[PDB]
Amino acid sequence: ADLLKSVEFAVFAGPANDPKGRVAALRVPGGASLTRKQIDEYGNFVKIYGAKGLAYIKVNERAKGLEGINSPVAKFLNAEIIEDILDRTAAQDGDMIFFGADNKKIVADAMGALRLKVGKDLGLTDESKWAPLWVIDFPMFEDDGEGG
Amino acid sequence: MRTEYCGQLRLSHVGQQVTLCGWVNRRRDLGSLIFIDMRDREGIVQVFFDPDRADALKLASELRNEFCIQVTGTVRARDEKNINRDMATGEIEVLASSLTIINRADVLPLDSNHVNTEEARLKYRYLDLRRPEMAQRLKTRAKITSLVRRFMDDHGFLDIETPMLTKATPEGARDYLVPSRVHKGKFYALPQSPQLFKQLLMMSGFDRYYQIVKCFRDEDLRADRQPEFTQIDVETSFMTAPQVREVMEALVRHLWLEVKGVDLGDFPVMTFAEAERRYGSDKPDLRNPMELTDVADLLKSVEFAVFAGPANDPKGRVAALRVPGGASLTRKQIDEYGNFVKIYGAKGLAYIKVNERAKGLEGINSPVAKFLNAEIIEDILDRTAAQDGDMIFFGADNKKIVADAMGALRLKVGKDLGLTDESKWAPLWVIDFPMFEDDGEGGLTAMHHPFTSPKDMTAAELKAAPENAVANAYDMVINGYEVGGGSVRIHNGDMQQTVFGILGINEEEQREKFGFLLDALKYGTPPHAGLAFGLDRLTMLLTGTDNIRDVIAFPKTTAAACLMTEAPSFANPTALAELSIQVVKKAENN
Amino acid sequence: MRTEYCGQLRLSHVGQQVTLCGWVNRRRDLGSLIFIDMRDREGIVQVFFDPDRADALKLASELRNEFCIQVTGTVRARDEKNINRDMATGEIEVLASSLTIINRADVLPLDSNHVNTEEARLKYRYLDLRRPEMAQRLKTRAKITSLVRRFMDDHGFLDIETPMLTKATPEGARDYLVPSRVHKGKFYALPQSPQLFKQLLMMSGFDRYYQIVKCFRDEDLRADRQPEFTQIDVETSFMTAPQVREVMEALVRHLWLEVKGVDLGDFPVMTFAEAERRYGSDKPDLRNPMELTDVADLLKSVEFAVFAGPANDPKGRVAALRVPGGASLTRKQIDEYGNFVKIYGAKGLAYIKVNERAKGLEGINSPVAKFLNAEIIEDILDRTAAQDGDMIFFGADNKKIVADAMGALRLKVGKDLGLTDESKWAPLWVIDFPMFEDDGEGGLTAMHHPFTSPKDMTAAELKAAPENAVANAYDMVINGYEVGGGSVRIHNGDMQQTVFGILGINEEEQREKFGFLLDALKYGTPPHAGLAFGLDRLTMLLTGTDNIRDVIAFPKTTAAACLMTEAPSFANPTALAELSIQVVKKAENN
Ligand SMILES: [Mg+2]
Ligand SMILES: [Mg+2]
């Protein structure tokens, strides 16, 4: 988000400047080879969780520039912003960066399941492994929907 | 100067010398003999350069992809073994006697035998529109608008232009603003449609109006949703809904005959209420033979809450989906669907496998048969008319949950089991759409524009029980897509006032949202009604595409940007200066 | 539900029972008899209510003008003594048998038995459109577009839509900006025309395009100048200019034959130079037989500063206007003219009365005879082929002021002396326009537009002497009005780049402003020419009207306002914040 608070592109800008939102990037290893068909399916899969789409950036020849990538949103971004993303997400040649731009809950829900799907669909998820962990500091309360 | 178009050559042209202007679509060589697929707007024709002299040839060996050339030669039959079935001109070829290279062509940035992002094609749109597959969709759109015009003009509709620069703060505040250089600080609005002007033209006595016109939306550019879209706009006077539907139906039928050669046949008509019940959609796909059956009343007394509750709830339903030949279905498959319906709010998906009715409870196989009984399952198999082999799926929830879930489940199953003949044309009319609904905080809001009239209510009965009042509105669906809609407007002022009252639109509001109109209704307003067909949809259906961008010559992307011209763009400060506006940004604490 | 239109009924209908729908135009009681002149878009029909049918006559006594009614009656022959030869339905009337008052009507705020101000009419536009004179204009406009469309279709032009949400481009003129809610800080531009998009379509393979589309000029609005106007946009491929004019000259003749029923003949053809040398404008009115003559060459050595000066000025000319029977003019008369030309920035208006060339200088009277001499005056008369009883005015100044003022005085003197036959049609083609025109700021501007091809000058020669380059451009003038025009486009990249150069736009700007255009020219661009027509002017000319606002359903005033809707207006403050913009003071910020 902090990388895109400026951009004129409201699709990113709105939610990046909106504290109840966020622009989330999901880096999928060697997912650049993903297909026109496959991207579109995911596009619709995220909708199930409230997402109004899925912007992407296909990373080909990293150290080559905006020339080294390939993205429908690249023109709404620029050279500097895109290196920051490829860097931050530690993208690699042949990698795929997916974007979720909406209110925190939707981005969490969409990119969270999307993150899971892509893992199984691409077998990046080694399910033979055991991954335990602690999640601490839960909110005290939840919205009750009726005000309380 | 051509004498004919490449793609129109046929066996009947043999012996005729022709002159063709076009482009090289593909080039192939047989030794020194050069074969070229010469293309122009009508399609491709094979042209062969076979001079028995090295002089004449020269030029031809230079031709490459997209060269713009002129050649004059004679038509002849292709040798039986080379006749091309998939080519309108495939039974003939042209033997060139003259060649003129009008203009070369650099190497194309768009790949021919490779895959191109819709991003590149959009950037090189003028290159992509050359593809015969692409040209054709736009050639057909031209025949479609030509057919509409001639049909409308013949049935007495007047083509009368309405303004694009219009009164701002018009509808939903979902429009484009155009700042005025002359009236500093003031704006016009690009129209959602000739919304109020066509009604004015009915007051002005024109009797029937239509226009092929552009419209603008300004929401979040969903895919299939451009920032501007063309509508076949219609308005009539002294006509009832049925009489409006009939003429608009003869239009579509006329379009299918003349374009696809199919006779759509009389359109079925349904009520918004019947549609949600039967198909769980206000836009039913009737290419799918299945349908939902209500069986709530058959289950109002069982002990099983899953059914008993939704069955007894006044705002709940228990829909039965009978899928012919579905008993032969996998736990795996029955589990996918089990999940699939979860996407729309379903908690589950009970089912009854029907193997052999004649044998009774022992004829079925079902996890819930236990909680039911012989009679109930018999009544249900009767209502749904289950044949041995059929599967009965049940969605038992809130009217909405069931509708979207089973609605969706019906569509998926049908495709899956090959039950829906994707190749059938299923047109219909959905009518009697509710009049109102809850808006944001409730109260009540118009399902259509506020000038729509009630179908079967009095101003008082309406003021008395508006919640479920039924509108005199109609929709044309073709294979599950809203392709048109309209309604009968109000001509009785008492009635218009009551609507506004129900709507919460007070006097000051009325006066600024549409005062000239309201004024216009004071001079003997005739009964009037209209409708609008989305031209883009119409064209998608008529050319078998599914991508809205394929029926528009210069479409924008989802982000409403144009990749070729690169609009929208930063404006010149000079210009912003005369316009008396300036770009600003929240100076949030800095 | 009507059965017929009030105005179509003729004797041929005598006998039938008809159901009319429409408005009460007039009402006349004749004893206990009630007569109504019922109206609908086809016209007026007299309706007779007999006391024999008690209830219809009962309701009919409440009918006032403009009531919306329905009457079912019987058509019948009026008596010979009651035939009204001035109504199309003047030989019949309808003996009513039933009446239904659909809606009463308030007294119209727009009086009809009297004349109104174009202003009051525009506020109640809807009402003013109920008038026959008015409604006939729109119906002929519908007829014309319909005759155009069938024409284009028969000749193979495809109707392809272009976008209205465009990219603000360099030069040309001024656009209406449209801020973007998705690309905050960026705009689109309403198109001045499908100018670059139609060429892009000729490069896409479509071969002939046309569209009846809206264009927006945000420059100050003149007399018959609306902010929006409609053009019959045309673009062709593989055709020369003479060929383009041919078919284009055919569409217009067809219009004049189908509409006013006149034949025009082959349009004469004049070059820009001839047109200026002879009439002082690039849109001459050949209805006026007079024509200007040049004499500067004869006045270089005169003492008289009023001639000598502009005659030795490279950018000046001294034009003589021989006005037949002009000697008869009076002093008050000669002075109005003298002042008249002042309006166009000219000085005075020297003159010579030729009473008898049979007396040399003695046969002529003049305030400037003493300045010229026996020789110079003989050449001036010969050159002008002056007749005894002829007046010769002289305009000496800057080429543009002379053309401007002398071509104006040429037209005015035409009406005054009754020398122009307002009844004739004078159509023609003005061709061979220059590529550029001095822009008053140091450089050059495209006479027609940046993409116009030069008749025969090479890129090099064009770099050498651009001011002198002749264009492959043509205008169609009819009676002194520019109805349409266009040019053969540039299909070569170096050429296009070169012109962008002369136009003062640099590589970088060319790249970012016309980059898509510069690339497309690399892929076999075919030769292509086009032309646009002024629909509104065409309709004006064909409906014999001089008020362009009389051919538009809902036009705006000269200040670009809509008195009926009240736009432009203030936009919702919120709307602007969502658009990331705000209105400012002309001074204030910067
Ligand atoms: Mg709808
Ligand atoms: Mg002009």
From Swiss-Prot, chains B, C:
GO terms for molecular function: aspartate-tRNA ligase activity; ATP binding; nucleic acid binding. One of its GO terms (biological process) is aspartyl-tRNA aminoacylation. SUPFAM superfamilies: Class II aaRS and biotin synthetases (SSF55681), GAD domain-like (SSF55261), Nucleic acid-binding proteins (SSF50249). Its EC number is 6.1.1.12. It comes from the Bacteria. One of its GO terms (cellular component) is cytosol. Keywords: Aminoacyl-tRNA synthetase, ATP-binding, Cytoplasm, Ligase, Nucleotide-binding, Protein biosynthesis. Residues 195-198 are annotated as: Aspartate. It is found in: Cytoplasm. NCBIfam families: aspS_bact, PRK00476.1. Belongs to the class-II aminoacyl-tRNA synthetase family. Type 1 subfamily. Catalyzes the attachment of L-aspartate to tRNA(Asp) in a two-step reaction: L-aspartate is first activated by ATP to form Asp-AMP and then transferred to the acceptor end of tRNA(Asp). Also mischarges tRNA(Asp) with D-aspartate, although it is a poor substrate. Homodimer. This is Aspartate--tRNA ligase. It comes from Escherichia coli (strain K12). The lineage of its organism: Bacteria, Pseudomonadati, Pseudomonadota, Gammaproteobacteria, Enterobacterales. The gene is aspS.
